[PDB]
Amino acid sequence: KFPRVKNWEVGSITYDTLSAQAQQDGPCTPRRCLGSLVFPRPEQLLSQARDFINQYYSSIKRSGSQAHEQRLQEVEAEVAATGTYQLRESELVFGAKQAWRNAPRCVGRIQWGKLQVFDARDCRSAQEMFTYICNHIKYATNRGNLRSAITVFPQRCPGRGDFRIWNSQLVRYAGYRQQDGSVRGDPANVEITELCIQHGWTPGNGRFDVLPLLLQAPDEPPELFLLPPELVLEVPLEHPTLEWFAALGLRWYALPAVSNMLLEIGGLEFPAAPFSGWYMSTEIGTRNLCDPHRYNILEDVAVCMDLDTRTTSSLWKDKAAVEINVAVLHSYQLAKVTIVDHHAATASFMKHLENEQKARGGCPADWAWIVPPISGSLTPVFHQEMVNYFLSPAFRYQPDPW
Amino acid sequence: KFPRVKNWEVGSITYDTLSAQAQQDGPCTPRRCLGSLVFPRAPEQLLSQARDFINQYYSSIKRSGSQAHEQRLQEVEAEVAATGTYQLRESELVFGAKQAWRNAPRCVGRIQWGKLQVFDARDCRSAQEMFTYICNHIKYATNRGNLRSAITVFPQRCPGRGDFRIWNSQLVRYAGYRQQDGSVRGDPANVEITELCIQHGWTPGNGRFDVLPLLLQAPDEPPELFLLPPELVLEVPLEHPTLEWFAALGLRWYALPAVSNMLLEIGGLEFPAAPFSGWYMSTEIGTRNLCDPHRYNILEDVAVCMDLDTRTTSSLWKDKAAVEINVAVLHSYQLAKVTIVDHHAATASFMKHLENEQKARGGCPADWAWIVPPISGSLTPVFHQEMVNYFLSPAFRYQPDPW
Numbered sequence: 028k029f030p031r032v033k034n035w036e037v038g039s040i041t042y043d044t045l046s047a048q049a050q051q052d053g054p055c056t057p058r059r060c061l062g063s064l065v066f067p068r069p070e071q072l073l074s075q076a077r078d079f080i081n082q083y084y085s086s087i088k089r090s091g092s093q094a095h096e097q098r099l100q101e102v103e104a105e106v107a108a109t110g111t112y113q114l115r116e117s118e119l120v121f122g123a124k125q126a127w128r129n130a131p132r133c134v135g136r137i138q139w140g141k142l143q144v145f146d147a148r149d150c151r152s153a154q155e156m157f158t159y160i161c162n163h164i165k166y167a168t169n170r171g172n173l174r175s176a177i178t179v180f181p182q183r184c185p186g187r188g189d190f191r192i193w194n195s196q197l198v199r200y201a202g203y204r205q206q207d208g209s210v211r212g213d214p215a216n217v218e219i220t221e222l223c224i225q226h227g228w229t230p231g232n233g234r235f236d237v238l239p240l241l242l243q244a245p246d247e248p249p250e251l252f253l254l255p256p257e258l259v260l261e262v263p264l265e266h267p268t269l270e271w272f273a274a275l276g277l278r279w280y281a282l283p284a285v286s287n288m289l290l291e292i293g294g295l296e297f298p299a300a301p302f303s304g305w306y307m308s309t310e311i312g313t314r315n316l317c318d319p320h321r322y323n324i325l326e327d328v329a330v331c332m333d334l335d336t337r338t339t340s341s342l343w344k345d346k347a348a349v350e351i352n353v354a355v356l357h358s359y360q361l362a363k364v365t366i367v368d369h370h371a372a373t374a375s376f377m378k379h380l381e382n383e384q385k386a387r388g389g390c391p392a393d394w395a396w397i398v399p400p401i402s403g404s405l406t407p408v409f410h411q412e413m414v415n416y417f418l419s420p421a422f423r424y425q426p427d428p429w
Numbered sequence: 430k431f432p433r434v435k436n437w438e439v440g441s442i443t444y445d446t447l448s449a450q451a452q453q454d455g456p457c458t459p460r461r462c463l464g465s466l467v468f469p470r471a472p473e474q475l476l477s478q479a480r481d482f483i484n485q486y487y488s489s490i491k492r493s494g495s496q497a498h499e500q501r502l503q504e505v506e507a508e509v510a511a512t513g514t515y516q517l518r519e520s521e522l523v524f525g526a527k528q529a530w531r532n533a534p535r536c537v538g539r540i541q542w543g544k545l546q547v548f549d550a551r552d553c554r555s556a557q558e559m560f561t562y563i564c565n566h567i568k569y570a571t572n573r574g575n576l577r578s579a580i581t582v583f584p585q586r587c588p589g590r591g592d593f594r595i596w597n598s599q600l601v602r603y604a605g606y607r608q609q610d611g612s613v614r615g616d617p618a619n620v621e622i623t624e625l626c627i628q629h630g631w632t633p634g635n636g637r638f639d640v641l642p643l644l645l646q647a648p649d650e651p652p653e654l655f656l657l658p659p660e661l662v663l664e665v666p667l668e669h670p671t672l673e674w675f676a677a678l679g680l681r682w683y684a685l686p687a688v689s690n691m692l693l694e695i696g697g698l699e700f701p702a703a704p705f706s707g708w709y710m711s712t713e714i715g716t717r718n719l720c721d722p723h724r725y726n727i728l729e730d731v732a733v734c735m736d737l738d739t740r741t742t743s744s745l746w747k748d749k750a751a752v753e754i755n756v757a758v759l760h761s762y763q764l765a766k767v768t769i770v771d772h773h774a775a776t777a778s779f780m781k782h783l784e785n786e787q788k789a790r791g792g793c794p795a796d797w798a799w800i801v802p803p804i805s806g807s808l809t810p811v812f813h814q815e816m817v818n819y820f821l822s823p824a825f826r827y828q829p830d831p832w
């Protein structure tokens with residue numbers, strides 16, 4: 028019943044008793060494992076609400092009586108009459124933290140208790156969303172001493188439309204095509220760029236044009252919103268010893284802020300609830316800049332390093348990738364912008380695992396996403412067996428609104 | 430309603446229909462994935478497994494549903510009646526060994542699966558003769574450094590008689606000598622087999638690269654100790670193309686990776702002694718065997734020697750040191766004219782395998798966490814490929830240590 032979990036570096040054994048509480052079934056069967064897939068393929072609302080409420084009161088040592096009893100009644104009554112319910116603000120804070128804590132693919136969860144919840148539930152229009160987003164970006168960026176923050180927009184209700192940010196992140200670099208179909212800019216953002224132009228925006232020259240937000244309030248078409256250039260903090264990339272690296276003209280923005288996932292708490296669904304923290308350097312250095320389907324700079328940095336690109340056994344890919352990562356770490360530190368290396372981040376995740384073992388009896392973690400995209404077996408997470416499963420509250424993916 | 434499989438570098442989409450034929454069950458449920466576990470773990474059932482293998486063999490030679498095919502089925506059912514088991518024909522054993530390689534989810538080398546030399550040792554009768562078959566395996570597979578993939582298959586498990594077992598996890602391994610202050614001299618992964626050897630009467634060395642003897646078990650016999658001839662075991666001194674102090678580390682590795690403690694299963698028959706060999710991918714030596722903290726653990730020493738800043742992680746001293754350790758493995762093996770494949774070439778040929786396999790069987794069992802190399806994962810094309818992991822037979826299986 029209770030999976031045995033071993034660390035092959037130490038020899039230590041634990042048992043995931045928290046896996047037993049799993050719910051919204053994942054994609055694996057005893058016949059075949061789909062753990063590597065990126066996407067796993069009125070009287071129930073109340074049951075998910077009762078469950079979430081009992082979570083809250085256990086956490087504050089307050090299961091069994093007073094306002095525990097009482098709060099269970101008012102949601103019962105509220106859904107009985109309205110067919111929905113509103114979360115108390117401290118609950119919305121509690122649900123936000125737990126959803127971060129339950130995110131299997133996030134290696135940064137050692138921070139799950141330090142999160143700033145901006146309550147935008149009284150939001151009413153698209154111009155209002157933009158003002159909230161700017162308070163978020165400003166507070167979250169904090170002149171480069173970055174601070175985790177989420178902003179929660181109104182919980183979708185039936186009969187009325189949906190609050191949805193159209194961009195996948197708040198800061199995204201446009202991607203423009205060519206006679207060759209080939210992109211200038213970031214190829215992951217080709218679709219949202221062509222939608223931005225097809226909505227008034229005026230495409231620019233270069234690789235690092237910060238996209239305009241496409242914000243949409245219920246039953247309205249999206250609305251463009253240009254971002255304040257002083258509010259989009261960016262870091263130009265230099266290398267500590269390769270003097271020519273700066274002249275490649277590479278940049279990356281400071282604030283990773285994901286604005287297209289659905290926050291679910293106690294049976295309510297928040298289609299627009301952008302959250303942000305701070306980068307892990309391999310995300311910028313390895314995936315965004317070196318993926319063949321992203322900026323794909325790997326061969327260009329290898330030529331500058333006079334590496335031999337004619338045979339793979341010179342490990343020229345590995346030498347260039349490491350140095351790109353060094354340049355990210357150096358440039359962010361020189362700019363006083365919070366960043367963390369994959370070694371520090373993974374070592375803290377191990378510490379998170381131990382904390383969460385004694386607290387909740389285990390921790391849902393997705394091995395293929397915790398292990399860094401470079402130097403995997405040199406970080407402790409590589410040697411650590413992990414159990415993956417869905418708990419609530421949770422962040423979920425959701426179809427794009429078109 | 431079979432898994433949809435996506436490649437994210439390119440956009441390809443496939444459906445793994447082969448996974449519907451998965452002849453057993455693994456550790457995952459809809460409630461929780463346990464893919465990262467290292468060990469995921471009756472005449473009528475022997476008959477239904479054998480019937481399935483005979484059906485495979487006769488498909489592969491384009492004789493399905495033929496007279497020869499029905500005759501063979503009746504033969505097997507009759508021999509399970511008279512004796513409780515059956516014997517494979519020679520050609521069936523060759524095909525079954527190739528399919529077990531082909532079916533192994535954690536092997537990135539399977540582009541090669543059809544080039545396998547199968548040594549039939551099912552007439553073996555003692556440990557001494559076991560030793561002879563094994564020396565011949567090592568000699569043919571090493572081939573003076575132009576490595577050849579081979580399997581030697583010893584007699585199947587059968588009732589009434591104990592098993593042939595190779596006690597060593599590989600045919601070539603280095604001793605690990607326990608010490609005080611509790612440290613290990615040599616390979617710490619082999620501390621246990623090293624003691625068994627000494628307690629079964631082996632005079633130990635005291636180096637870090639001392640080749641272990643073989644502990645070989647005939648049925649209902651105690652294991653017997655055999656020293657490999659030094660000149661049968663090809664080895665590679667490690668040096669680095671530009672860091673000349675590297676050679677002064679005194680590091681070595683052996684040419685032939687020959688796994689000897691797994692069970693080969695075909696048509697319900699079990700072969701607990703069937704060692705098999707190919708050639709190394711450089712990351713197994715460079716990253717795992719040499720840089721794992723619980724193996725030779727040379728990362729920090731290399732980094733200090735490189736004058737890297739080991740006081741802070743953000744210099745990426747570990748990454749830089751490990752890359753050069755891999756360069757040195759590749760450089761040394763190529764200098765010595767010993768076959769070796771780097772993680773880039775290996776993973777690219779696995780991508781071609783996946784395409785070969787999709788067209789041929791409608792999919793391919795693959796374990797993403799083991800296929801993706803331990804350095805530079807997303808620099809390789811397998812990182813961006815979704816995979817479906819499942820168990821087909823014939824198969825290589827883990828089996829418990831005989832002590």
Ligand code: HEM
Nearest residue numbers: 127130131132133134135138175302303304305306307422
């Ligand atoms: C504070 C520093 C943080 C770091 C270093 C960090 C790091 C990461 C990384 C590396 C990923 C992998 C995604 C990818 O590689 O594509 C990830 C995913 C994710 N993170 Fe974190 N993150 C941080 C903060 C946060 C915050 C503040 C939240 C929510 C409030 C959060 C929730 C998530 C979620 C939901 C995912 C999606 C993965 C899933 O499906 O579970 N993270 N994070």
Ligand code: HEM
Nearest residue numbers: 530533534535536537538541578705706707708709710825
């Ligand atoms: C010819 C070159 C070959 C290469 C480069 C290769 C490569 C690899 C690598 C890198 C691993 C994973 C080990 C690790 O990373 O810890 C592996 C596993 C494995 N390989 Fe290969 N291999 C080769 C030949 C063979 C042969 C000849 C056989 C059997 C006849 C074989 C069967 C296996 C099996 C059974 C596993 C374990 C799979 C599992 O537990 O699911 N390989 N291989």
Ligand SMILES: Cc1cc(N)nc2cc(-c3ccc(OCC4CCC4)c(CN)c3)ccc12
Nearest residue numbers: 065135283284285302303304305306307310
């Ligand atoms: C708060 C935060 C901080 C940080 N440092 N990193 C973060 C990374 C993600 C993230 C989650 C899922 C993702 O993938 C979804 C696939 C569908 C299209 C890609 C990706 C990009 N792969 C990023 C989300 C939040 C992050």
Ligand SMILES: Cc1cc(N)nc2cc(-c3ccc(OCC4CCC4)c(CN)c3)ccc12
Nearest residue numbers: 467538686687688705706707708709710713
């Ligand atoms: C023919 C061959 C060639 C090659 N180049 N490599 C090979 C690697 C393995 C192999 C199998 C299982 C392993 O581990 C199993 C866990 C249980 C105890 C460890 C490991 C080491 N990870 C390697 C087996 C055969 C290989």
Ligand SMILES: C[C@H](O)[C@H](O)[C@H]1CNc2nc(N)[nH]c(=O)c2N1
Nearest residue numbers: 063064395396437812813814815
């Ligand atoms: C196919 C494969 O699962 C996919 O490329 C995953 C692998 N692991 C990952 N891990 C992280 N952190 N981010 C990713 O985008 C991916 N991609």
Ligand SMILES: C[C@H](O)[C@H](O)[C@H]1CNc2nc(N)[nH]c(=O)c2N1
Nearest residue numbers: 035409410411412465798799800
């Ligand atoms: C616990 C963890 O899954 C384990 O160490 C695995 C991960 N992936 C691996 N992948 C390969 N190829 N070889 C290994 O030894 C491992 N180890």
Ligand SMILES: [Cl-]
Nearest residue numbers: 283310311315
């Ligand atoms: Cl990003």
Ligand SMILES: [Cl-]
Nearest residue numbers: 686713714718
């Ligand atoms: Cl090995």
Ligand SMILES: [Gd]
Nearest residue numbers: 271330331333
């Ligand atoms: Gd130059």
Ligand SMILES: [Gd]
Nearest residue numbers: 670671672673
């Ligand atoms: Gd030198």
Ligand SMILES: [Zn+2]
Nearest residue numbers: 055060457462
């Ligand atoms: Zn699974």
